[PDB]
Amino acid sequence: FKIYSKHTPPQGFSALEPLVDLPIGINITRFQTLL
Amino acid sequence: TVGYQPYRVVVLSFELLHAPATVCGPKKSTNLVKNKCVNFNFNGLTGT
Structure with missing residues:
Protein backbone atom coordinates (compact mmCIF):
# COMPACT_ATOMS: atom_id res chain seq x y z
CA PHE A 1 0.00 0.00 0.00
CA LYS A 2 1.73 3.13 -1.28
CA ILE A 3 1.21 6.78 -0.36
CA TYR A 4 2.30 9.94 -2.18
CA SER A 5 2.00 13.45 -0.77
CA LYS A 6 3.02 17.07 -1.25
CA HIS A 7 2.53 20.44 0.42
CA THR A 8 2.31 23.84 -1.23
CA PRO A 9 1.19 27.36 -0.23
CA PRO A 10 -6.13 25.01 -7.45
CA GLN A 11 -4.58 26.04 -10.78
CA GLY A 12 -1.16 25.20 -12.19
CA PHE A 13 1.15 22.20 -12.35
CA SER A 14 3.08 20.38 -9.64
CA ALA A 15 4.57 16.94 -9.03
CA LEU A 16 3.78 14.47 -6.26
CA GLU A 17 6.52 12.75 -4.26
CA PRO A 18 6.08 9.44 -2.45
CA LEU A 19 6.50 8.96 1.27
CA VAL A 20 6.19 5.26 2.08
CA ASP A 21 5.04 1.81 1.02
CA LEU A 22 3.55 -0.38 3.74
CA PRO A 23 3.72 -4.12 2.90
CA ILE A 24 0.34 -4.68 4.50
CA GLY A 25 -1.79 -6.63 2.05
CA ILE A 26 -5.34 -5.58 2.91
CA ASN A 27 -8.35 -5.99 0.64
CA ILE A 28 -9.50 -2.39 0.23
CA THR A 29 -12.75 -0.88 -1.04
CA ARG A 30 -13.66 1.96 1.35
CA PHE A 31 -11.70 4.99 2.59
CA GLN A 32 -13.95 6.61 5.21
CA THR A 33 -12.35 9.93 6.12
CA LEU A 34 -12.30 11.65 9.50
CA LEU A 35 -13.26 15.24 10.33
CA THR B 1 18.23 -32.36 40.78
CA VAL B 2 18.31 -34.75 32.57
CA GLY B 3 15.46 -36.44 30.72
CA TYR B 4 13.02 -35.66 33.54
CA GLN B 5 14.20 -32.23 34.70
CA PRO B 6 12.68 -29.25 32.84
CA TYR B 7 13.91 -28.16 29.43
CA ARG B 8 12.55 -25.04 27.73
CA CYS B 37 35.91 -2.41 -12.63
CA VAL B 38 33.86 -4.08 -9.91
CA ASN B 39 31.14 -6.71 -10.13
CA PHE B 40 28.67 -5.28 -7.62
CA ASN B 41 25.21 -6.58 -6.69
CA PHE B 42 23.85 -3.24 -5.57
CA ASN B 43 20.87 -3.88 -3.21
CA GLY B 44 19.12 -5.72 -6.03
CA LEU B 45 20.95 -4.06 -8.94
CA THR B 46 23.44 -6.62 -10.26
CA GLY B 47 25.60 -4.64 -12.66
CA THR B 48 29.30 -4.47 -13.43
Whole structure:
Protein backbone atom coordinates (compact mmCIF):
# COMPACT_ATOMS: atom_id res chain seq x y z
CA PHE A 1 0.00 0.00 0.00
CA LYS A 2 1.73 3.13 -1.28
CA ILE A 3 1.21 6.78 -0.36
CA TYR A 4 2.30 9.94 -2.18
CA SER A 5 2.00 13.45 -0.77
CA LYS A 6 3.02 17.07 -1.25
CA HIS A 7 2.53 20.44 0.42
CA THR A 8 2.31 23.84 -1.23
CA PRO A 9 1.19 27.36 -0.23
CA PRO A 10 -6.13 25.01 -7.45
CA GLN A 11 -4.58 26.04 -10.78
CA GLY A 12 -1.16 25.20 -12.19
CA PHE A 13 1.15 22.20 -12.35
CA SER A 14 3.08 20.38 -9.64
CA ALA A 15 4.57 16.94 -9.03
CA LEU A 16 3.78 14.47 -6.26
CA GLU A 17 6.52 12.75 -4.26
CA PRO A 18 6.08 9.44 -2.45
CA LEU A 19 6.50 8.96 1.27
CA VAL A 20 6.19 5.26 2.08
CA ASP A 21 5.04 1.81 1.02
CA LEU A 22 3.55 -0.38 3.74
CA PRO A 23 3.72 -4.12 2.90
CA ILE A 24 0.34 -4.68 4.50
CA GLY A 25 -1.79 -6.63 2.05
CA ILE A 26 -5.34 -5.58 2.91
CA ASN A 27 -8.35 -5.99 0.64
CA ILE A 28 -9.50 -2.39 0.23
CA THR A 29 -12.75 -0.88 -1.04
CA ARG A 30 -13.66 1.96 1.35
CA PHE A 31 -11.70 4.99 2.59
CA GLN A 32 -13.95 6.61 5.21
CA THR A 33 -12.35 9.93 6.12
CA LEU A 34 -12.30 11.65 9.50
CA LEU A 35 -13.26 15.24 10.33
CA THR B 1 18.23 -32.36 40.78
CA VAL B 2 18.31 -34.75 32.57
CA GLY B 3 15.46 -36.44 30.72
CA TYR B 4 13.02 -35.66 33.54
CA GLN B 5 14.20 -32.23 34.70
CA PRO B 6 12.68 -29.25 32.84
CA TYR B 7 13.91 -28.16 29.43
CA ARG B 8 12.55 -25.04 27.73
CA VAL B 9 11.41 -25.37 24.11
CA VAL B 10 10.62 -22.80 21.42
CA VAL B 11 9.13 -23.83 18.06
CA LEU B 12 9.26 -21.47 15.07
CA SER B 13 6.86 -21.46 12.13
CA PHE B 14 7.30 -19.14 9.15
CA GLU B 15 4.40 -18.48 6.80
CA LEU B 16 4.61 -17.62 3.10
CA LEU B 17 2.56 -16.03 0.29
CA HIS B 18 -0.31 -15.00 2.56
CA ALA B 19 1.23 -11.54 3.08
CA PRO B 20 4.27 -9.86 1.48
CA ALA B 21 7.64 -11.10 2.67
CA THR B 22 8.55 -9.18 5.80
CA VAL B 23 10.61 -11.20 8.32
CA CYS B 24 14.04 -12.55 7.36
CA GLY B 25 17.81 -12.49 7.71
CA PRO B 26 20.06 -9.43 7.67
CA LYS B 27 21.77 -7.81 4.68
CA LYS B 28 25.47 -8.70 4.85
CA SER B 29 26.87 -5.63 3.11
CA THR B 30 30.51 -4.64 2.64
CA ASN B 31 32.61 -1.71 1.47
CA LEU B 32 32.70 -0.20 -2.03
CA VAL B 33 35.62 0.61 -4.32
CA LYS B 34 36.47 3.61 -6.51
CA ASN B 35 37.80 3.71 -10.06
CA LYS B 36 38.16 -0.03 -10.70
CA CYS B 37 35.91 -2.41 -12.63
CA VAL B 38 33.86 -4.08 -9.91
CA ASN B 39 31.14 -6.71 -10.13
CA PHE B 40 28.67 -5.28 -7.62
CA ASN B 41 25.21 -6.58 -6.69
CA PHE B 42 23.85 -3.24 -5.57
CA ASN B 43 20.87 -3.88 -3.21
CA GLY B 44 19.12 -5.72 -6.03
CA LEU B 45 20.95 -4.06 -8.94
CA THR B 46 23.44 -6.62 -10.26
CA GLY B 47 25.60 -4.64 -12.66
CA THR B 48 29.30 -4.47 -13.43
